[model samples]
Structures are given as C-alpha cells and as structure tokens.
Target chain A: YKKPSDAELKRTLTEEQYQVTQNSATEYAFSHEYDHLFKPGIYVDVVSGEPLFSSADKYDSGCGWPSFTRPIDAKSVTEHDDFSYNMRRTEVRSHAADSHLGHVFPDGPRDKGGLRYCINGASLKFIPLEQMDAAGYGALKSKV
Target chain B: YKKPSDAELKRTLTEEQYQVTQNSATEYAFSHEYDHLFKPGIYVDVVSGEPLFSSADKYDSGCGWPSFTRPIDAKSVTEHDDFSYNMRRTEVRSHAADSHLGHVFPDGPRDKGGLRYCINGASLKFIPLEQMDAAGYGALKSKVK
Candidate 1:
C-alpha cells in the first residue's frame, strides 16, 4: 500500500498524531487513549492502516504505554538502534509507512518471551471486534 | 570498520558528541566548533572516522551550523526523511556508523549546487592538511589544499 506523504498527513491527521508518527515524539505516558484499552480489537498503524498488534498479544506491563508481547506479524514492524536522549534503546516503526511507533524493551513477563513492545497509542488505531470485517481485517478477527 | 558499541562510545565520546551522534540530537547553532571553521582540512565522522565533507565544499551559510556544498563522497553519507519538529527535513547520517550528522536544505548558494549540508560540528572531527596522511586520510589531502 502507498503511504501518505507528510503534506497529505498534515491535512488528514491531528496535531498529536502527526507529531507522534512523523516527528518521533512520544506521547505522555499513561495519557494515550489506548494505554489502558484492552477491549477485543486489532491495533493498526494509524498512518498506513497495516495490521500490527492484536488483542491476543496486548498486555498490561504497567509501563505507562500500551504494551504488546509481539506484533501480529514480525514483518509488520521494524526495529532500529536509537541512541537518542543518552539512552540506548530500540526504536520501532511501522514497516509500511515508516512512522515512529515507539520502543521495545527487554523487561517483560518471562512466559511471554520477555520482550515488551512499548508503543504509542497515537501511532495506532483500534478496530473493534465487531468492525473487523468491515475494516478489511476479517482475517484477524479470530485473534481479537 | 566495525562501529563501537554505545557502552564503548559513552566511555570514549564527550557528552555533546554522544548526544549528537547517537541520540540524533542537534548541537547549538553557531556554538559548534566547526560552524565558523574554514581552515584547509577535511571533516570526518567522529565515530567512524569515515571521510565526510571537504573544506573545498565548506561555505558560510549563515545558518550557524557548519555548512557544506557536498560530501567528499556520496557513499560516505546517506539521507533520510526527517519528519520531526513539525517540519519536513532531510536527515544526513554517516553511512558507515549511522551517526546523525545533520539536516540538508535546498536553500544554498546556487553556484554551489544549491544544497546546504547543515551539519553538526560535534558529529565531525576536523583533520588539518598536515595531518591527513598521519590520520589515515592521505587520499583526501588534495581536497584540503
């Protein structure tokens, strides 16, 4: 799928969404709409509309951001070494749009492979279980 | 060359160097060491020591940061779309070490290719003409002169 240009995004997305996705800005911890959202749904890249995380992988890591055990598909996202702010961290971005999602940390539940994907809610859009089919994500409906 | 790890870099680089190279942070305009430097020399990536900009291409763009018309070699640096800070910009980085160098803008002197390579002095290390051979950059000595 073709990713929208920054100019197009400027008109389509909100100021917060543009900042988080385009400028790599982090939303305030625990203040995002999906930080505490656990309803059955699929989280897709707000810009690219690519399937990223499902409710099945969502967890409460209490890290103030939405936590995921893993992306729905490993190919949906990509990781890069981010040595910004004086901290060595892994920055995650949407594969299709290259939009900044968030970071992945090593501290997570042992049973969940010990990887915590701390993502920004502003970078994702939730498609409710009931709307999966209409949203073109019917294939992942079962995971929700 | 194998790039040094962040742990090693933290021990080697100054606070400003690490901040600018690793974290994509920009140095203060006009205050950077190379912003006003026009001595005959070549600027290399401080981390990878890869050849970047030559003094022949350096120009005073009045933007405060070090300015260059072009890199010594196109392959020595890479550009990416930087959509941060509510402005659309192009980010330039060391191709070898992926060190954040700076942004490039189209507003440059038309005679000099009309491209401004606004680079962070902290991300670079200048090698003077006399030290080029000793610094393993003998190939670029002519450009400095």
Candidate 2:
C-alpha cells in the first residue's frame, strides 16, 4: 500500500492520536484509555486503518501498559533505532501508515521471546471479537 | 478559536482537499465547486475556523473561479512568494489555519480593487447570507451592512 500524505494524516487524525502516531510523542503513562482493557480484539493504527496487533499476544505486564508479545502481521510493522533521553531504544511503527506504533525491547519475559512491545494506546483502535468476521479481520482471529 | 492540529486535518479532509489546503497543491482551474455560486453569503477558512471572505466581495470574473475582491478581514489572510514551478507566484493562505487558500494574481479587472483571489473551494466553507447571523458570522456581516 502507499503512504498517506501529511495533509491526509493531518485531516483524519485527532491531536492525541496524531501526535503519538505521527510525531512519536508519548502519552502519559496510565493515561492510556485502553489500559486494563482486556478483550478479544485487535489493535489497529489510529490514523489508523490497518490492523497490526491482536489480543492473543497481549499480557498484563504490570508496567501500566497493554503489552504485546508480537505484532499480528510482522510485515505490517517495522523497527528503527532511537537514541532519545540518553537511552538506546528500538522504535516500532506501522509500515503502511508510516505512524509510530511504539517501541520494542529485548527486556521482555525471556521464555516468551525476550521482547516487549510497549506501545501507546492513543496510536491504536481496538476492534472487538464480535465484529472481527464482519469487519474483515476474521483471518486475524485464527492467529489470535 | 481553537487551533487545529495536523492530525485533525488528516482525519477530516478528503485527499484532494487536504492536498490543496495543507500541501499547497493547486486545484485544476474550473474545478472549484463554488465557482458559479453567487448566492449572498461568506466563506470561512476550512482549517483555521475563521471568517475569510464575504459574499459582498464575490464577483463573477469569467475565470471559472469564485473571485473575491478581498478577504472579509484583510488580516485574516496572508500572502507569500511561492516559486516551486519555475515561476514566481503569490500564494495566499489563512493566517490562523496556515492552510493554503490559493494564488493571487494582479491580472483581475482594473476595477473593484483590481485583484482576483483564485482559491480552492475545498479550503473553504461557504455560509449563505440568510445564515450569517445564525452561523455566528454576524460580526462579519457588519462589514457589508
């Protein structure tokens, strides 16, 4: 798919949604509306038209975040080097939408894959399981 | 008025409109939706949410454009030198929204201010005369009254 233009992103996304997804700005911790929202669903980019994560890989990591073990579609996402605030970080983002998704770390539970994808809830739109089939995400339910 | 963020524009405007307003891309001549619309009213900047043009300044110029003698509040708009296509042109845009409006040319009829503000309908929301006061544009209507 093609990446949307800046004006396209500017017109369709909200301030919070746009800042986090487009500018890589972080939302306040525990302020994410979706924290503790544990349901059978998928998390798509908020400017957000594509699916990237599923609830199946989610785990309550006690970091005040909705952590994901992996993205639903590996090709749909990407990772890049980030050195901000004096720390080396791997920035994660969606390739199709070209918006920031979050960051991945090698500090996750070692047994599960030694990786943690700490993401911003503002960057995501949750789709419930009930609507997965009708919403064209039925294929994702199998992986979840 | 609350300043709109880039994300809000991306979410609300169409691709064509978004490119024209935010990216400064020009719309095809004669493609403006309100080109022939001469009903009494006003035009506001779609992004900045500010009053821009008054119907009192609207006139048919046969350029297939919705020509404006001037903005309702000259301060509401700003002009800059744009030179991207190998020629110098004056680019007009909203001061608050910072969205592109269109180009201003000095080739307008010698009367009525001798200016033609060729703008894209996508960057504007026209408020008909009957609804100016009802649409909270009474402040702008005062100029024409």
Candidate 3:
C-alpha cells in the first residue's frame, strides 16, 4: 500500500495526530481520549486503517496512556529502540502505515507476555464491536 | 533536532535515498557501495546525521548488504517487528532520525551477537577514520582502531 503525501496528511490529520504519527512525538500523559475508555472494540491505525490492538487486551497500567498486553497481531506493529530524552525505551509503530503509536514497556501483566503496549489515542480510530462487520473487519470480530 | 520538510528532503536527497529513508524501500542486494568497504570508520544517518554503526562491528556476513554485529551504541538503533512480504522479520531503524536502515537477522557470527544488521548503503553516510577528528567524531576514533 502507498503512503499519502505530506500535503494530504497535513490536510487530513490534526496537529497532534500529525506530530505523533509522522514526527514520533508523544502525547501528554492521562490526556488521551482512549486512556480510560474500555469497551468491546478494536483500535486501528488512524493513518493506514490497519487493526492493531484489541479491547480484550486492554488494562489499566496507571501510566495514563492506553495500555494493552499485546497487539491484535504481533506483525501488526513494529518495535524500535528509543533513546530519546536520555532514556532507553522501545517505541511501537504501526506496520503498514509506520505511524508512531506509542512505546512498549516491559512492565505489564505477568501472566500475559509481560509487556505493555502504551499507545496514543490520536494514532488510533476505535471501531465498536457491533460495527466491525459492516466496516469490513468481520473476520476480526472474534478478537474483541 | 528538527526534521526537514518533505519538499526540502525531495530537493536534497536522491530518488533512491529518499525512497529508502522515507518510504522503507530496500535496494538491490550486493549493489551498495559500502557492502565490501571494510575500512575503519563510522556510519551515520544521512537524514539526521546521527552516529549509528561502526567499522569495529562490521563483518562479512556473505549476505550482500553491509553487515554489522552491533551498533555504535545499543541505543543508536531501534528494532521493529516487520511482517511484510508474509515473513516474520525484525526491522532496524536509526534511533534519533527513525530512518529505516535495514533488518536484523539471527544468522550471524557465532562468537559475536549472532545478529546481522543488514543495512542499506543509501540510508547511511560513511565518514572514514582519518576525517573523524575534523568531522566532530574525534571521540569515536578508538572504535575504528
């Protein structure tokens, strides 16, 4: 799939969305819309419309960002070594679109993967479970 | 550091450079200039000028692309879960600039890290050993030694 031009992205995405996805910028803690929203849905990349995280994996990490035990699919996201701000971190990005969703930390549910995918709300577009079939994501309905 | 605009990058970088850095496109195997140039020096990101791999970590992986056992620093690069081409692979990118350099494979030297950083020459700017001091990389001269 082809990525959109900068002009098209600028016109479509908000300032925060553009910064997070394109520039690898992080949003403020506890300030995202999906931080506290827990429902039966799947979070997809706002830029590429690729499914990434599921609500079933969501949990409160008290880190203020949307936290998940794992991705809907391991191949759906990519991990990068992040050394920004003089700290070592693993940055997570969407595979298809290369959007910087957030960082993945080692502190997570001990029983499940022991990793937390801290994602940004701006990088996602939540599609509720009921609308998944009509949205062409019927196959992934079982994930939620 | 601030990144350049798309227009500026397009105007500055070659088509191949732009495609590899911005679009995550890979070049033809064994077609890179640094594939066999095993001289003492450091590889920096062409996009952000961030120091990445060193010649000390360079090795002939017989994999065509420029191969490295490790980065100049562990934090200099980032790893990503790449599931493209229906294959499960780990993608390597520069830490600061987030430039897509290449992928990291498990088939490498036994005594070394056993990970090969298969990098694209187009995504790198090689600064040879002699000019390191003049290039503000004087501290890394010992790495090439």
Candidate 4:
C-alpha cells in the first residue's frame, strides 16, 4: 500500500503517537498497558491508526514485548540499531507513522523466519478480523 | 575492518555460505540445525563461519528461529528490501560470509526491544565465551575485550 503523505500523517496522528510511531520514541519496557495478552489480529499505531504488522506473524520473544518475524510489508517499516539505555538493540518503526513499535531479534522460530520484531502493546491497537471493517480497517479486510 | 576483498570472500566461503550470507539465500525455514538453543556468545554462518550476530543481544521472538536485536557490528551486516516467495520482507546477510541469515520483522516485544535479527540455524554456528580464544577466533577476541 502507498504510504500516506507526510502532511497527511502529521494531521492524522497525535503528537505522542507521531513521536513514537513516526519519530521512534520508545515507551518504557514492561510499563506499557498492553504488555502481555495480545489476541490474533492486526496492530496499528494508536495515534494515526496505520496497519503495521499482522498478529499471524506475532510471537513471544520472551522479552516482555510483542514480536513479529516481519512487517506486513518491508516498505511499511523502518529499522535501525538502538544503543540507548546503555544497551544495544535493533529497533523497528513504522515508515509511515515512524512509530516506535519495538526491537527485532534473531532468536525466534526458524520454521517461520529467523527474525523477531519485539514491540510494545501500548504503542498499538489490535483489530480482530471480525471487527476489522467496522473499525475502519476496510483496506486491510481483504489482506487479512 | 574493511570488507574482505571480493576474491577473499569468494575463496573463504563455501557455495552455500556464499549464497546465504553474501547472496542472501533463505534456506528452508526450520531446516537449520540450531533453532531453539541459545546461549550467550556469537552466531556465525555455518558455511563460512563469519560472525553474524552476538548472543549478547539475542532474544526469543518465538517464530521458530534464532532471533537477535542487532548484529555484533553494524558494518558486518547489510539490510535490503526483499519481495520474493510471495512475501514482502527485509533480507539480511553477512558482509564477509554473505549468507542469507534471515529477515527482520516489526512485531516484537515493546518493552525491552528494538529490531529482531531473525536468522536461520543452517546459516549460523554459536560460539561460547569459554572457547572465544581457543576456538581460533583470535580476531574476535578484541570484541570481548
């Protein structure tokens, strides 16, 4: 899917969401509200509501955060190594919203893919398939 | 260190390592040898034995592959957009071995994380600290130092 224009993204997201999703601001680890308990569905940024990763790809990276092997699309996400907090890690963010979703790691189920995208629950909102369309995720309805 | 000369890489790596680490060949998932077993150390390509990622940053992404948040060194790896096998994903490979480690995804733990270095077991070999020096990895000794 084509990314929304920068101007459009700015208008659609709140400052906080924009910072986390677009600018890669990280929420404290283990402190976010949706720490555990994510049901099957699609996860979008809380502020701009852009479809980031599907739950079908979600996994337990054992790091107290959400993780996926890949994004819905490579074009949709951006990645870089994060060395903040006196530690180093690979960080994942939405290319559109640039929201700080989580970190990516190599310890995951090899049967699927060799990567894991560890993410924050508070940074995202889940939309189950049943509620996808009703919740304004019509564009993703067909993909799911 | 500067990239090994192309001739050097070509000579040092096996055909498979050359394809996976340098050429980005994705071995059949789960076909790798070391999938779930992870200990603090380094994971090198099985074919070329090039250090790909460090256990220092490894984590469980629960996707049936060895996952890491970052490589031991950014310069040693490369990332590119991959659209193959009817899937859109990111492709990662080692600069020296040039083996296809795996893809990085974005659905990871939010609290203590960033990027996931999803890698194939067939592509790597784990190196524990106990054997760091005795294992003929003299060049890597400085990393631990």
Best by TM-score: 2
Instruction: Report the C-alpha lDDT of model 3 over A6-109, residue by residue, as the tens digit.
Output: 89999999998999899987787777889898989899999988999999999985766888999999899999866331123688999999999988878789
| Fnat across every predicted model, in order | 0.04, 0.06, 0.00, 0.00
Answer with 2 or 3, whichever has the higher DockQ.
2
The TM-score, computed over Cα atoms with residue i paired to residue i, of candidate 3 is 0.51
Global Cα lDDT for candidate 1: 0.86
Question: What lDDT tens digits, residue by residue, belong to model 3 across residues B21-57?
Answer: 8888777767789989899999999998889999999
Whole-model Cα lDDT per candidate? 0.86, 0.80, 0.86, 0.67
Q: Give model 4 RMSD, 1 decimal.
A: 15.6
Per-residue lDDT for A49-106 in model 4, tens only?
7788887777664455666778777776788766331123677776765667767777
Highest lDDT: which candidate?
Answer: 1
Question: What is the per-candidate TM-score for chain B?
Answer: 0.95, 0.90, 0.95, 0.71
**Count of steric clashes across candidates, in order:** 4, 15, 3, 70
TM-score, candidate 1, is 0.53
Off by over 4 Å in 3: B1-145
Model 4 CAPRI quality: incorrect
lDDT: the better of candidates 1 and 2: 1
